Design a protein around this ligand. Sequence first.
Ligand SMILES: [Ca+2]
Lengths: 223, 175
Amino acid sequence: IVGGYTCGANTVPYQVSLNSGYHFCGGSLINSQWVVSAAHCYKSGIQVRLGEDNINVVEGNEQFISASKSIVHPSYNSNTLNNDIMLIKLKSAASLNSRVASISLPTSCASAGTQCLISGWGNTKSSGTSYPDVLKCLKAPILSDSSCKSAYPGQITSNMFCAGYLEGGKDSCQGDSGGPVVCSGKLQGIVSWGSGCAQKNKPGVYTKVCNYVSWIKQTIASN
Amino acid sequence: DDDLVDAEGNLVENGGTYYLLPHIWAHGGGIETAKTGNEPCPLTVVRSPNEVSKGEPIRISSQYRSLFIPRGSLVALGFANPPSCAASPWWTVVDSPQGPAVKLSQQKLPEKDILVFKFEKVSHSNIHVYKLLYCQHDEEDVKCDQYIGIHRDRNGNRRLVVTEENPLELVLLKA
Ligand SMILES: [Ca+2]
């Protein structure tokens, strides 16, 4: 997260960290035993770590749960970055408290202009690479479909949306992937892709969760 | 739990800089630019004529905002230290008297013209090595059914070009 601020310990109780020995992708808790991330964050043997702030060290609120099932969207297309969404089932329900809580799925697509909270432990600098110990936060608005496509001609499908600033300066970055984009209290997006970080005319592109919700609820209801 | 790995057995960091060397130390050194034919400056991507030269530091990037390069992801390869005239440090594939060749452009290029590569590990497992695929877009389904190879020319320049039976192999070394 470049140009953002430190969220504060467990202030984003749904922020999850996918670990494969080390942190490689964010995720979002949607209920006691199902997590949502990006399809491109798929890996075998995922350890989902919840209630985290400082991902490097243990602080007393973490909950380490091995992944049981990792279902990547059937239509994921690694080339086109399309349908970049993945579901994760925990081998064991998570104890929901104040530090660990779920985020409501969006039953309605948010309109452009809506302010969102993007979260993650990714690089916090434009040029250069500096990963944070604790969760970084960032408020950014949903951009219009015409501007999004204006920034990325020929690369935007109806399953993705831009959020951020054409001006640049503030944005999501490497290591934020799979993380949440919560707007008006609902997981409207997932950190997916983008050209560079905080670059001009190159905002973040996120998986449009609202188109996938019916699928999410279905799979959770049959897996 | 992933694929793209350098020489030292460490994960290839997205946006980081690496040297691209051959598998067999007899084909050349690292990658670099060169002035070939009728170019106004170094706009041709070739292998170092040297065989011990780490070449030029090269950045490997993916659109994805992950710490590493996701398997099957298309990537762009650019010179960490761009040359003179290049309006972008990123490689692209343009038609030439020789045939499709890896060049640098003086024209600002869009994502589509640069995100046309994709690494592919080799069968001979004894050290992390990869073949470089060339993926030209189609109709919202870019197909990687071609490779990038070496074409030594009239002046000796080992220029990188698109082949289908003379693919090159590479090992990545953190710059
Ligand atoms: Ca911790």
